[PDB]
Amino acid sequence: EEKEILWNEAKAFIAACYQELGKAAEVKDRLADIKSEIDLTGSYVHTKEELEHGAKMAWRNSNRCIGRLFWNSLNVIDRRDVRTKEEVRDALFHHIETATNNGKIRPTITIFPPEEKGEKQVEIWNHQLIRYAGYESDGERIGDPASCSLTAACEELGWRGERTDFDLLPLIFRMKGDEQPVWYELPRSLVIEVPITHPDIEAFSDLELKWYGVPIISDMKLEVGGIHYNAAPFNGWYMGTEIGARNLADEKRYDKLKKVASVIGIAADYNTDLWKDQALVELNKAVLHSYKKQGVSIVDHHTAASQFKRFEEQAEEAGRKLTGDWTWLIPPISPAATHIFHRSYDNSIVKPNYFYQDKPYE
Amino acid sequence: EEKEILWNEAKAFIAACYQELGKAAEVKDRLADIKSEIDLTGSYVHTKEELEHGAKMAWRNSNRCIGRLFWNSLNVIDRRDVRTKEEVRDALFHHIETATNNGKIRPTITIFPPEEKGEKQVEIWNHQLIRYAGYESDGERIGDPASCSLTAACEELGWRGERTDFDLLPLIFRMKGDEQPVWYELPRSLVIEVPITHPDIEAFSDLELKWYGVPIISDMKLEVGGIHYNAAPFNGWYMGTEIGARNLADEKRYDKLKKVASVIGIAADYNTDLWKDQALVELNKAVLHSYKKQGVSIVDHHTAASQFKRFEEQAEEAGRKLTGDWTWLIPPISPAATHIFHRSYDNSIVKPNYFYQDKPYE
Numbered sequence: 001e002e003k004e005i006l007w008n009e010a011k012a013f014i015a016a017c018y019q020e021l022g023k024a025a026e027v028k029d030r031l032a033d034i035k036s037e038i039d040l041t042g043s044y045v046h047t048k049e050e051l052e053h054g055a056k057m058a059w060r061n062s063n064r065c066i067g068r069l070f071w072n073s074l075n076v077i078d079r080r081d082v083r084t085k086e087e088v089r090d091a092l093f094h095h096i097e098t099a100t101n102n103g104k105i106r107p108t109i110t111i112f113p114p115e116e117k118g119e120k121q122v123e124i125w126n127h128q129l130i131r132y133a134g135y136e137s138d139g140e141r142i143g144d145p146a147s148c149s150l151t152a153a154c155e156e157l158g159w160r161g162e163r164t165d166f167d168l169l170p171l172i173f174r175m176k177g178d179e180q181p182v183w184y185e186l187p188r189s190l191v192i193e194v195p196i197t198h199p200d201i202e203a204f205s206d207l208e209l210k211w212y213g214v215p216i217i218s219d220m221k222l223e224v225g226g227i228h229y230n231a232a233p234f235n236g237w238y239m240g241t242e243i244g245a246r247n248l249a250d251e252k253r254y255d256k257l258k259k260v261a262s263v264i265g266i267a268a269d270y271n272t273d274l275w276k277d278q279a280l281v282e283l284n285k286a287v288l289h290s291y292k293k294q295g296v297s298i299v300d301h302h303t304a305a306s307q308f309k310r311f312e313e314q315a316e317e318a319g320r321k322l323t324g325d326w327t328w329l330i331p332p333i334s335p336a337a338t339h340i341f342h343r344s345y346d347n348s349i350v351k352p353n354y355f356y357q358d359k360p361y362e
Numbered sequence: 363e364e365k366e367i368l369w370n371e372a373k374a375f376i377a378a379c380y381q382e383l384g385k386a387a388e389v390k391d392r393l394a395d396i397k398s399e400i401d402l403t404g405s406y407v408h409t410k411e412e413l414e415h416g417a418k419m420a421w422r423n424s425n426r427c428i429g430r431l432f433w434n435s436l437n438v439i440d441r442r443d444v445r446t447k448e449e450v451r452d453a454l455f456h457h458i459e460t461a462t463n464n465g466k467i468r469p470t471i472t473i474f475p476p477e478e479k480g481e482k483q484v485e486i487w488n489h490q491l492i493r494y495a496g497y498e499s500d501g502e503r504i505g506d507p508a509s510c511s512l513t514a515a516c517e518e519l520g521w522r523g524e525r526t527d528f529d530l531l532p533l534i535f536r537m538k539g540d541e542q543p544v545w546y547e548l549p550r551s552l553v554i555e556v557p558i559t560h561p562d563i564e565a566f567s568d569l570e571l572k573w574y575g576v577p578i579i580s581d582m583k584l585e586v587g588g589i590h591y592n593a594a595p596f597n598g599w600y601m602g603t604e605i606g607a608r609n610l611a612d613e614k615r616y617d618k619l620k621k622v623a624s625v626i627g628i629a630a631d632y633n634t635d636l637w638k639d640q641a642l643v644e645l646n647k648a649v650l651h652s653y654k655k656q657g658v659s660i661v662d663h664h665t666a667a668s669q670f671k672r673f674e675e676q677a678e679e680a681g682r683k684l685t686g687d688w689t690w691l692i693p694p695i696s697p698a699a700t701h702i703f704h705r706s707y708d709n710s711i712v713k714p715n716y717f718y719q720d721k722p723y724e
């Protein structure tokens with residue numbers, strides 16, 4: 001059964017992929033090769049062309065992503081050759097360095113050996129390669145609450161955070177055959193961070209806010225033609241609202257709106273004053289200003305939705321069905337000011353794609 | 363078949379309604395009476411108790427409405443006795459007067475005779491009882507574009523608008539047996555309007571914006587126990603974002619954000635400045651300020667979502683399933699600042715309920 005699933009997924013993927021690459025005449029022979037390989041080994045190996053186009057198709061098919069206009073320019077790094085934890089560490093360090101590109105962010109994915117029979121070869125524990133620790137004791141929170149459980153697991157492995165609000169978590173991953181993950185501190189020279197200041201309000205620096213430059217999602221499974229790449233970290237650049245309307249604003253994250261209200265000089269006393277809305281706008285202006293001033297890539301939500309509109313037009317022109325998740329594509333501020341809010345999207349799942357998988361901790 | 367549908371819908375409604383009213387022992391005899399009445403007449407007549415509770419249940423079941431906490435205090439006016447167009451006009455004038463209540467808005471529904479065999483007795487053409495006309499010629503728009511088609515139809519019936527940006531449309535409705543609807547100008551003494559000013563920015567009055575006090579939806583069908591009340595206008599009060607983030611802001615409505623930007627003294631040149639977001643916040647603060655200053659009821663979106671949270675808790679406490687449409691319940695500004703954004707809702711349709719119906723014009 002598992003073997004039949006693989007072959008059916010393989011057939012669909014190779015046909016579509018080779019059609020897109022103008023290789024339709026080669027499908028028959030490639031599918032023959034594959035069936036034999038599956039018959040003998042219980043699996044098959046993608047060509048570098050298949051793996052690269054597959055990762056790009058997976059991005060193109062991600063219903064929740066507003067940044068898909070740029071799917072075809074994804075930089076795919078093939079690391080299916082790694083066998084040791086030093087090689088994984090160095091590959092993850094390299095990804096950070098080349099994706100960061102001195103601030104001019106390059107969308108990149110590094111692809112590690114895939115699952116064999118559901119057995120992982122490399123298991124990454126981080127949610128993002130660069131993220132801040134979170135702590136709770138004594139009732140008072142320090143850092144990013146979304147990182148509380150992983151931070152606690154790292155402190156079970158001999159690591160200790162300084163307990164600032166912005167401790168960088170170490171890389172943490174497990175190799176097939178090892179019982180415990182290993183961890184490595186991130187070299188600070190690799191990690192660009194951006195201090196948050198406001199273009200007009202000098203007091204805004206009093207909040208001492210910062211965020212990291214490059215979001216690199218490292219806990220999703222890339223599925224391509226029935227092959228499960230559970231370890232394939234990827235990055236784009238931030239849309240500013242992710243930082244300003246969610247990471248720094250959510251009550252269960254950094255919860256900064258009352259402090260923002262205070263430094264911008266407005267009362268935070270009455271719902272009818274819309275002080276939360278006003279604070280959210282100024283915090284989001286500060287995030288965009290600060291990234292731009294630092295020379296780190298970022299996109300505002302209006303420009304992002306305009307880009308997504310072009311992606312919709314591109315799909316229609318290419319004769320491709322468009323899929324999307326309206327509830328995630330709308331930005332969390334001024335959503336009715338974007339075209340997204342005023343149309344609907346088919347939320348069907350199409351493969352290749354990126355999928356959630358169970359956490360190894362918790 | 364139609365008759366079977368009616369009986370099945372009647373059974374479900376009477377059982378549930380009488381259960382809620384502590385009248386469970388009367389269900390059997392009432393259902394007997396009903397089946398006979400259906401058998402003889404092809405229909406049945408609600409008691410005043412059934413009609414009143416039915417309208418309230420219909421509101422409670424409206425998935426898209428954030429204001430449902432107050433469903434049980436709906437003021438139901440029974441006008442199933444009307445037979446003439448003068449009686450309909452006077453009933454609609456009365457609804458406006460008693461719902462408006464000098465600014466302290468009372469949620470109210472007036473219920474007219476229902477469809478008989480799909481044949482309407484009274485057919486209301488207005489989308490809302492109080493709404494502004496819209497015109498397009500010469501390329502330039504005047505008034506509310508959402509009213510363009512109905513305004514054109516009214517001008518086919520001998521009415522003529524002054525072509526200001528805020529012309530009040532007349533009431534327009536058709537009686538069973540008449541080929542054309544009749545129209546009646548609204549007495550201005552019945553219509554409260556609110557000029558839009560800003561609490562801190564004096565220049566805001568230069569925009570000369572206003573909106574009407576009471577939104578009274580008059581084109582939906584109330585369905586209760588298989589009976590179709592196609593004419594049953596209802597009103598609550600506004601949530602401020604409806605006016606400030608949509609009616610005055612949408613590009614296909616009054617499209618005022620660039621003018622707002624100008625009077626609040628910010629540039630409207632760069633997406634990264636978030637000038638649309640800032641303009642939206644100040645316009646929405648002005649709307650809430652102006653309604654409050656005029657003594658007209660209105661709710662801000664933060665308070666409304668807090669009320670909706672209580673509605674969710676009330677349902678769970680009463681053992682009632684909650685249904686909702688996430689895509690409409692989230693407010694169009696700062697939606698992630700409300701609890702609504704962070705949970706999900708079952709969008710199942712439950713009756714009694716309010717439904718769209720085909721327009722008689724267009």
Ligand code: HEM
Nearest residue numbers: 059062064065066067107108234235236237238239299354
């Ligand atoms: C180039 C810049 C990019 C931008 C501005 C962008 C923007 C976004 C945003 C704003 C989200 C919503 C995230 C959230 O609210 O937590 C998102 C989701 C997503 N993006 Fe993109 N994205 C970009 C590139 C990429 C790349 C390169 C990939 C993969 C190759 C990717 C795959 C996804 C996926 C899978 C999700 C869904 C995550 C989930 O369900 O939790 N995106 N994107």
Ligand code: HEM
Nearest residue numbers: 421424426427428429469470596597598599600601661716
């Ligand atoms: C008491 C104050 C009320 C408030 C603040 C309120 C709030 C709202 C809001 C903001 C919407 C979304 C409208 C839009 O975006 O166009 C809505 C939808 C709705 N409300 Fe309420 N509402 C209230 C009372 C009522 C009443 C009294 C009824 C009926 C008896 C009602 C039935 C509905 C229905 C049917 C919709 C959906 C309209 C559609 O699908 O187009 N509401 N409500």
Ligand SMILES: N=C(Nc1cccc(CO[C@@H](CN)COCc2cccc(/N=C(/N)c3cccs3)c2)c1)c1cccs1
Nearest residue numbers: 067215216217234235236237238239242246356357358359
């Ligand atoms: N653990 C799960 N999933 C899960 C649980 C909680 C949260 C999440 C994801 O949380 C998101 C909340 N906003 C955060 O996602 C971060 C993200 C994802 C994609 C793009 C993001 N932003 C960017 N611009 C980019 C990052 C990388 C490329 S572009 C950020 C996932 C599971 C569910 C079922 C089985 S496992």
Ligand SMILES: N=C(Nc1cccc(CO[C@@H](CN)COCc2cccc(/N=C(/N)c3cccs3)c2)c1)c1cccs1
Nearest residue numbers: 429577578579596597598599600601604608718719720721
């Ligand atoms: N014509 C249709 N429906 C339709 C078409 C276009 C638009 C609409 C409704 O437009 C809404 C856009 N936001 C406007 O609804 C106005 C509204 C509805 C409910 C509550 C509203 N606000 C309030 N606070 C209240 C008004 C009355 C009680 S509370 C406003 C409905 C049909 C579809 C299928 C068959 S007919």
Ligand SMILES: C[C@H](O)[C@H](O)[C@H]1CNc2nc(N)[nH]c(=O)c2N1
Nearest residue numbers: 340341342343344689690691692
């Ligand atoms: C396509 C989309 O569902 C549509 O534009 C909806 C979105 N959510 C909404 N929500 C409310 N409250 N009112 C609306 O008119 C809309 N428009």
Ligand SMILES: C[C@H](O)[C@H](O)[C@H]1CNc2nc(N)[nH]c(=O)c2N1
Nearest residue numbers: 327328329330702703704705706
């Ligand atoms: C319940 C709801 O679907 C959930 O909170 C979603 C809403 N839309 C979202 N949209 C984005 N882009 N990111 C998110 O984390 C969420 N959260």
Ligand SMILES: [Cl-]
Nearest residue numbers: 215242243247
């Ligand atoms: Cl993030």
Ligand SMILES: [Cl-]
Nearest residue numbers: 577604605609
């Ligand atoms: Cl309205």
